């Protein structure tokens, strides 16, 4: 039950559990959850130091840290046995040198579609992507839609969220551009055909979750994230060099965190403005952000004044 103002040091009733939560998306969401005040239970994988910058968001006693692998069961069960809701955002890009990378979007959402669901949770929310389709593209883009249906058997009502491409501060897609200081700046691939997708802004992403976390009645009715106005152009790549004026890796360097001349280069150039009959963002309001105002912030190059 709630009490008083939710400025800080309140209760607000809810008890969530956010896995992953070390990347760009999962950190910034929880930084709202410790503001209204709740028992945020965040288990991390293998990183005691990489959560140090996380702690000064929850006040005192509100956050807690645990260890878990994911291919184990009870480490994903012992933590979640006392909560109310649970979301998940776990996953990444290219296949590890040790992992399997296919079932990580299949059995790992199923590993928390285990007794976890049976224990008595509700409003379990997974993430999707707007472009994850069952078609033969790509090795990473498809095999995400396999988890969208084969795991949808479990949790018959979820409201699995479907975001478009996101832009914020430290993502990969927008920082894939302007990290291309090279002997040639080529677009993908010297063509202005499909560019671009829908870059929804990161405040709208974290605002959609907190409205849905006690909405109510948002289970099963899956939602889609609208982007900006409206599709986007080829001008974006020229918009980079115009205004820019042309975490547990290793001790020295990681040997392979590459630009990946593989199916990475096509997972973004496959836009797929999908079905507008999903409700999915404006009804889970209110999210309305342009691009031209937030572009000064993330871009940072040598001029810095003019």
């Amino acid at each position: 039950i709630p009490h008083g103002k939710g400025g800080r040091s309140s209760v607000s009733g809810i008890v969530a559990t956010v896995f992953g939560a070390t990347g760009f998306l999962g950190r910034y969401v929880v930084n709202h959850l410790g503001r209204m005040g709740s028992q945020v239970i965040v288990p991390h994988r293998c990183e005691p130091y990489d959560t140090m910058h996380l702690r000064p968001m929850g006040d005192l006693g509100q956050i807690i840290f645990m260890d878990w692998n994911g291919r184990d069961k009870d480490s994903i069960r012992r933590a979640v046995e006392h909560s109310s809701v649970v979301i998940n955002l776990v996953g990444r890009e290219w296949e590890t040198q040790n992992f399997d990378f296919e079932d990580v979007f299949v059995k790992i959402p199923q590993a928390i579609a285990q007794v976890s669901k049976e224990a008595g949770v509700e409003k379990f929310i997974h993430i999707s992507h707007l472009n994850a389709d069952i078609k033969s593209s790509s090795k990473y883009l498809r095999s995400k839609a396999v988890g969208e249906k084969e795991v949808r058997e479990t949790f018959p009502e979820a409201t699995i969220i479907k975001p478009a491409e996101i832009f914020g501060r430290e993502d990969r897609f927008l920082n894939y551009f302007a990290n291309i200081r090279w002997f040639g700046g080529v677009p993908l691939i010297s063509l202005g055909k499909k560019t671009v997708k829908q870059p929804v802004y990161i405040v709208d992403v974290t605002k959609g979750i907190i409205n849905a976390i006690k909405d109510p009645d948002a289970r099963g009715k899956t939602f889609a994230f609208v982007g900006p106005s409206r599709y986007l152009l080829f001008d974006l790549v020229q918009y980079v060099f115009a205004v820019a004026h042309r975490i547990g890796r290793l001790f020295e360097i990681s040997p392979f965190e590459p630009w990946t001349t593989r199916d990475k280069v096509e997972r973004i150039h496959t836009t797929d403005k999908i079905l507008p009959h999903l409700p999915g963002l404006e009804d889970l309001g209110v999210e309305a952000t342009p691009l031209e105002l937030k572009a000064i912030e993330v871009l940072r190059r040598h001029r810095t004044y003019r």
Binding site: K5, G7, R8, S9, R27, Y28, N31, R35, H53, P56, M57, L60, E297
Partner: protein, 208 residues
């Protein structure tokens, strides 16, 4: 009466009864009350029309040097119909004597400041502006000392509560250190301490 009682003296109680008497005699324009403390102190209650010249009279003489400006303070008193109370304290170098100047005022009514009369009031006079809002007249540089840049409170009066409203916190929402309404972990439990039965006979009020 006994040991462990302070032995008072009458010599300093005599001359300080003597010296301050002919002060009101030679300026019956500004002086409205003089009183002698029972432990060799003197108050000269002054309506603040004569804020400059009486100091200027004590600035120099041949029978009263008094050129050591020690203490400018400020005391608020609610339920007086003129709240505040500016109180000086100055020192005679050649004579070893303490005397204070009690000048009342109100909030909006300004006071002619002592800037040409003394140059030790350069940082003291600004402090009452920052803490109360008592706008002194004709100061060359009025600014903000000993408070933070965004306050609107003038905190040393009584209506300003113990904590402010401005408990500060950090978030990584973008970069900023943002303000927020104030939230404590504990009440500051306020006690109740005034015992009854009136331990003091001498200061007994007019019983009405």
């Amino acid at each position: 009466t006994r040991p462990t009682v302070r032995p008072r003296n009458d010599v300093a109680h005599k001359q300080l009864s003597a010296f301050g008497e002919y002060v009101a005699e030679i300026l019956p324009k500004y002086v409205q009350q003089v009183q002698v403390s029972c432990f060799n102190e003197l108050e000269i209650c002054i309506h603040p029309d004569g804020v400059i010249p009486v100091l200027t009279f004590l600035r120099d003489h041949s029978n009263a040097q008094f050129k050591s400006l020690a203490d400018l303070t400020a005391v608020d008193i609610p339920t007086r119909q003129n709240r505040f109370e500016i109180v000086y304290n100055l020192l005679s170098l050649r004579f070893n004597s303490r005397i204070r100047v009690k000048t009342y005022t109100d909030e909006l009514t300004p006071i002619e400041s002592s800037v040409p009369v003394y140059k030790a009031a350069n940082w003291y006079e600004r402090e009452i502006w920052d803490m109360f809002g008592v706008f002194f007249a004709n100061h060359p540089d009025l600014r903000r000392i000993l408070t933070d840049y965004g306050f609107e409170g003038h905190p040393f009066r009584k209506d300003f509560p113990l904590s402010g409203y401005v408990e500060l916190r950090y978030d990584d929402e973008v970069k900023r250190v943002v303000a927020e309404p104030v939230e404590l972990a504990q009440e500051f439990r306020k006690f109740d301490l005034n015992s009854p039965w009136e331990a003091f006979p001498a200061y007994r009020q007019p019983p009405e």
